[PDB]
């Protein structure tokens, strides 16, 4: 039973450095080929680096000179050191077990590397109030989670109780370089006076936690 | 740098049917071709290697064929858990390369969106920006045209769309269009309208509001 | 006595790279200008010498190593290279003195449906030393549970076939390779 | 070590181009140099090669009378004179260098080790 968990990803500025690590169980890392494969958001997979079972290392041309793959068998850990980072290095990075430098038969879960000059900023949460006019006996309400960086945020409704009809949209990068997002949910209009609706927005890169009560105007 | 071209970009079928996904290489890669599955928010899973060998624990309905420059993944008796993105990967020449993916989505009956519009909160207006939101709830197919009309003028360049992944239960989509203005520009207009066209609508639907009511 | 280079280059069958062949060339006169001045060899690289002046030099004695690898691996048969062939099959030292010759052998070593006779070593925990030959077929233990001689999970056969077909792209086609490593008993004319 | 192609681009039917492959990072004396063309949506084909001996071999029928390959070891470059150009000749042209035996020339792209990234030749009509 193989298991791989990557960690270390976060926001860095262009030129900065970052060391990703990948904990492994189910095999011996020092006698196996291992690879780093990255996926830029909304895009496809790009091979980054491979370390052979004997210790030789190879790198995509995009990253040769500034990335170094390494491993510690004592800790059963694979490492990707990254220096002189550029914006086009932004991606989820996966650690993968490599069968003879041919294909990737086991993958970790991925750790997100964001390279950007923009600075950490917590969201502002604004209500999306149900209109008196809604259509079908059901009413929509929500929270606009605007101008945060970097990804991710988590949104829940009534601290996990309300999940039916909840759509938390993918985040969008605006021109400023900050992310914006919305969470909406459909409820009975009957329940607008009776029931309370509160969204719980969490953004750990900036330690922001907002609980905003959404309610009619 | 062998380029892998995947086809089609999107494939829309229903459970029980047959899916045929093609990968085409800019150079011969012999049998050195692999297939991967990726569900949203998850990692790739190896499915096929050596063009035709299944990975450990992969069901029999998955099977690869082809060689040289043309390869096919076939999923014979589709099940809900099978709708995901599929990647090919050559290892004939270095560097190893992936295709750009083929997305397999569940085909359902046409469902029209229910449409809502939200004016900016007073609290956000205090900050000096106004965000108007239009929501297209629970529709299919994914393609829909949203069009902002401010005092009947068509508003271009100032809005952004987001779309959920296909709902696991009813296979529908949701869309948000967000129109962002400064408070100064927001208070130069009266009527904000979201106009929506879709296959499930006999004629476009407009939801609108008047600033300050 | 003239050096038996035809027996090396023109041999009916070549060795697989993991079990590469090595022939000593001793007390004969050698003509290397026959080899260099032809249209035959797509690779003919010399290190420490010039191909021009190969005949008018003398060596203690010479070794002719030979094997078959695919074309895009022939570049691994050079000093300082790394890769599966250089790490686990045939390794040249960093200070190598000699010549490396290779020609396409698709018309000799390819078979329809695949020639699976040539093998290379895929798995190994340490790199070979220069001029090491490793012919063990031990199951490779890539995990912690011992293999006890049966392939399965984390237990792989260390060797792999090339499977040369005549319809492969020429990058994947078989190439025959001869490496020439350079009192004194071996001289030119 | 790099191989940069130049001299191509737009040209009229009947016009000529002079392609230059400039090699850096190594000297071209022992190397044979080949010129290849890739037409829209196909794989590369060998056009013509010169060996370390300086001898030429042209691999396309269409191009024997028209193209002439030349080598300059002192300036470290190789030339392809293309006369009587036709719409059929439009392609991305690459050059490649391979260290073989004296008279060796190769029609096959995957048999050269050093490769250029290519230059576009477009002929009207
Ligand atoms: C090998 O055979 C060829 C063809 O008969 C011959 O020309 C050549 O001299 C022989 N020996 C060597 C070393 O190539």
Residue numbers in the entry:
A (entry chain H): 1 to 82, 82A, 82B, 82C, 83 to 100, 100A, 101 to 129, 131 to 214
B (entry chain L): 1 to 213
C (entry chain A): 334 to 515, 521 to 527
D (entry chain B): 2 to 52, 52A, 53 to 82, 82A, 82B, 82C, 83 to 100, 100A, ...
Provide excerpts from the study:
The SARS-CoV-2 spike protein binds the cellular receptor ACE2 and catalyzes membrane fusion. Conformational flexibility of the trimeric spike protein allows each of its receptor binding domains (RBDs) to exist in two major configurations: a “down” conformation that is thought to be less accessible to binding of most neutralizing antibodies (NAbs) and an “up” conformation that binds ACE2 and most NAbs to the RBD. Structures show that the nanobodies target two distinct epitopes on the SARS-CoV-2 spike protein.
An SPR-based binding competition assay revealed that the nanobodies bind to two distinct regions: U, V, and W competed for the same binding interface on RBD (interface UVW), whereas VHH E binds to a different RBD interface (interface E) and could bind to the RBD at the same time as U, V, or W. Although VHH V binds to a similar epitope as that bound by VHH U and W, it is oriented differently on the RBD. However, incubating spike-expressing cells with VHH E, U, or W resulted in cell-cell fusion, as quantified by mixed eGFP and tagRFP-t fluorescence. VHH-induced fusion was particularly prominent for VHH U and W, resulting in fusion of all cells in the field of view, and was somewhat weaker for VHH E. VHH V barely induced fusion, whereas no fusion was observed in the presence of VHH Ty1. As expected, spike S494 mutants were resistant to VHH E and VHH EEE, whereas spike mutants S371P and K378Q were resistant to VHHs U, V, and W.
